[PDB]
Structure 1
Amino acid sequence: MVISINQVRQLYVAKALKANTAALTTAGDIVPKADTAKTTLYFQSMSPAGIVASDKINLKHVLYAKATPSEALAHKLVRYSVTLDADVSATPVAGQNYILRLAFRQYIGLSEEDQYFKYGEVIARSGMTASDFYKKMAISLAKNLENKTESTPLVNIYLISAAAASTDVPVTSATKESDLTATDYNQIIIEETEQPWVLGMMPQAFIPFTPQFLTITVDGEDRLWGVATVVTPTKTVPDGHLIADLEYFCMGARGDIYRGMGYPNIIKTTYLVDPGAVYDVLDIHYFYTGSNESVQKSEKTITLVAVDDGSHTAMNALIGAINTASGLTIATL
């Protein structure tokens, strides 16, 4: 995952916070060092091959410093609630074919011009109610979408029982309608899923979607049979696949830019981000100006990531160690 830079950006994983240079013993330790005059801030840390210090931040030449929680960096998956249009008919009219076109927009390619469509179809019956429609619609959608031998999963299908109204009933291709026994179904939730991820090589990306409806002949009138509204999101993609890509890039500004290229003839870098753990990010953005005529700024930033467990314990202690050393006023998340 290549990112943009204002100028060079360095990341330091804060796996443990110490109080001296001498206490740095394990890979992932950190200590914010400063003066007693508070004119220079740097971060001594323990690399996987020894102690390494960061750049020296002039505390007069800081632009901003802000700390971002984990839930700010968690992607909310988009949900769409597919119902029958009550103006058209609240019950399925008999003998009509109910086709639904899910329009994917950023399928495999990177643009909106690379598009993809998955269909679901139900021909309504004489005694088919609304819940028996949503049952057969979601069985037909999951049969087309969530086959096992697809290339990537696209969306998740969930019925909702009107008695429950807050618990998602998962519908897959292996699901039969013998398993779906509830008689009060009021919507079909279609919700996007998390794509695969390889660190550095495949970034975190999502394929957005919209459900679209073909018209039915209701009373001699070609009316589109349903409406699709976007309900509030109830799931989040965690921060871990985003920070490990943020470390894989920012370990070439310190380390090797040739990552893997002539394969046995490489330096291999040890990365201290566990991709299955959430992190909080602190961005100290600062600059350098020269003596007399070298007044152009070299605006750069030093990133710090700390793993946090619910309440942000390790980041608020990191900020509290920076604020007493630097004299800064970084706000605590």
Structure 2
Amino acid sequence: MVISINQVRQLYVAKALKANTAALTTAGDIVPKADTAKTTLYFQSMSPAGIVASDKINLKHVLYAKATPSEALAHKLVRYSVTLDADVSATPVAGQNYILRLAFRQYIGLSEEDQYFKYGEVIARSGMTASDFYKKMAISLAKNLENKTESTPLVNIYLISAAAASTDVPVTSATKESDLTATDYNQIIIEETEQPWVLGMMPQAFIPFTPQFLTITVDGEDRLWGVATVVTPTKTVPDGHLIADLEYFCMGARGDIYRGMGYPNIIKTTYLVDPGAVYDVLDIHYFYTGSNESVQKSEKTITLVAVDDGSHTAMNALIGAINTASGLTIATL
């Protein structure tokens, strides 16, 4: 990624809270250190290459400080519930083609001027029920999608038998009408799909979409046959891949800005965050003001990360330490 800065921000991973210096044995350790008067604050971190200290924090020049619970950076995958509007007809008309158009915006490019469309077509018959329609439409969608020899499709297409209403039965281009057997399928689902992520080159990004039904002739009039309802998501992209590219970036203000540019000729940088875990976060914003004529402020940030076991034990213990040391009052998430 590439983020914006209040002229600088630096990141320090906190895998273990220690009580004092000389207890920093393993890399990624952290201990907050402050004067007894509570004038300044700084963090002594155990880098892979040794021990290191954060910049100093004049506790009367600190602007804001707040911690994030690691549930605020998870991206919920958008999922639609496509159905038939009983307004038009609770069942398929016997001779019309039910096309469904998936409108994808900010496809490969960044702009919404970058649009991609994928169709799922179906024709109905005299005896076609709503379930038979849903499964044939899901199959058509998955087969027009998921022709990828590349990866998981732009969206994940599921179905739901009214007997469950909770389990989502997948539908892939390899799925066959024979393995979908239930007779009470009551909707077609389409869930946003997590895209690839490689450290420092491909930031966490998604392709939003909209199911755009087309018009069928019901009673001589042209009418839209579907209802693209947005259901509460059930699956999220965890924080691990944002903190990873964040450290990748904030470890170039403290270290090497060249990252692979002369490939053999490199300053290898050992990062301490695994993109497979989840991390709470704590930002502290503060400035440095000079003397008589140098009153201009130099604002800076010091952000820390700590894994979330679901109860926020690590960061909350870290919060308590910083508050007992600096006398501050940061809220324990």
- Is TM > 0.5 for Structure 1 vs Structure 2? yes
Distance 2:151 2:173 in 1: 15
What's the secondary structure of 2:121's corresponding residue? strand
Contact 1:153 1:195 in 2 (8 A): no
Give the C-alpha shift of residue 290 in structure 1. 0.3
After the TM superposition, list the runs of 4 or more consecutive aligned residues in structure 1 that deviate by more than 3 angstroms: none
1:147 Cα offset (Å): 2.3
1:267-286 per-position Cα deviation (integer Å, ceiling 9, x unaligned): 01000000100000000111
Assess if the C-alpha contact under 8 Å between 2:9 and 2:300 holds in 1: yes
Residues 161-197 of structure 1, C-alpha deviations (whole Å, 9 max, x = no match) = 1121121111111111211111111111111100000
Measured after TM superposition, the shift of residue 153 of structure 1 is 2.5
What whole-Å deviation, never above 9, does each CA across 1:2-32 have from its counterpart, x for those lacking one? 0011110000000111111100011110000
Question: How far apart are the structure 2 equivalents of 1:297 and 1:188?
Answer: 56
Q: CA deviation at 1:86?
A: 1.2
User: Which runs of 5 or more structure 1 residues have no equivalent in the other structure?
Assistant: none
Provide the rounded CA distance (Å) in 2 between the counterparts of 1:11 and 1:144. 44
Summarize deviations over 1:10-64 as a string: whole Å, max 9, x none: 0000011111110001111000000100001000000110110000000001100
> How big is each residue's C-alpha offset from its partner over 1:101-131, in whole Å with a ceiling of 9 and x where there is no partner?
0000011001000110010011101100011
1:257-272, aligned counterparts within 5 Å?
A: 257-272=257-272
- C-alpha offsets along residues 67-102 of structure 1, whole Å, 9 cap, x if unaligned? 001111100110111001111111101121110000
Are the counterparts in 2 of residues 105 and 207 from structure 1 also a CA contact under 8 Å?
Answer: yes
Structure 2 Cα separation of the partners of residues 6 and 161 of structure 1: 52
Paired residue secondary structure (2:249): helix
User: 2:146–2:152: 8 Å Cα contact kept in structure 1?
Assistant: no
Instruction: Please say which of residues 168-177 and 298-307 is displaced more in the overlay.
Output: 168-177
The CA deviation at 1:148 is 3.6
Question: In 2, Cα distance between the equivalents of 1:6 and 1:22?
Answer: 33
**Over residues 288-317 of structure 1, what are the superposed CA-to-partner deviations in whole Å (9 max), with x where a residue is unaligned?**
100111111111100000012111111101
Q: Which is further off, 221-230 or 250-259?
A: 221-230
Distance across 2 between alignment mates of 1:253 and 1:40 = 22
What SS does structure 2 have at the residue aligned with 1:328? Answer: coil
Q: Is the contact made by 1:24 and 1:51 (CA closer than 8 Å) also made in structure 2? A: yes
Taking the aligned partners of 1:121 and 1:241, their CA distance within structure 2 comes to 37
CA distance in 1, matches of 2:33, 2:145: 55
Instruction: Note the alpha carbon deviations across 1:242-282, whole angstroms, 9 max, x for none.
Output: 10011000000000011111111110100000010000000
> RMSD in angstroms over aligned alpha carbons?
0.9
Give the corresponding residue for 1:206: 206
CA distance in 1, matches of 2:287, 2:28: 26
Matches of 2:215 and 2:234, distance apart in 1 = 31
TM-score between both structures, scaled by the size of structure 2: 0.98
Distance 1:263 1:181 in 2: 55
The aligned counterpart of 1:314 is: 314
**What's the CA shift for 1:151?**
6.0
| Greater mean alpha carbon deviation, residues 293-302 or residues 96-105 | 293-302
Q: CA deviation at 1:152?
A: 6.0
Contact 1:124/1:133 (<8 A) preserved: yes
Q: Give me the whole-angstrom Cα distance separating, in 2, the residues matched to 1:31 and 1:78.
A: 40
> Which stretch shifts more, 213-222 or 233-242?
213-222
Q: Give per-residue Cα distances to partners, 1:198-252, cap 9 Å, x unaligned.
A: 1111100000000001111111111111111111111111000010011000000
Deviation at 1:150, TM superposition (A): 4.4
Q: Structure 2 CA distance, aligned partners of 1:268 and 1:242?
A: 21
CA gap of 1:151–1:107, structure 2 versus 1, over 3 A, is farther
Whole-angstrom distance in 1 between the partners of 2:308 and 2:208: 30
Equivalences, count: 333
Q: Which residue of 2 aligns with 1:14?
A: 14
- Report the TM-score, using the length of structure 1 for normalisation: 0.98
For the residues of structure 1 that align with 2:92 and 2:233, how far apart are their CA atoms? 28
* Aligned-partner SS, 1:302: strand
User: Quick check: 1:15–1:307 contact (8 Å CA) kept in 2?
Assistant: yes
Tell me which residue corresponds to 2:225. 225
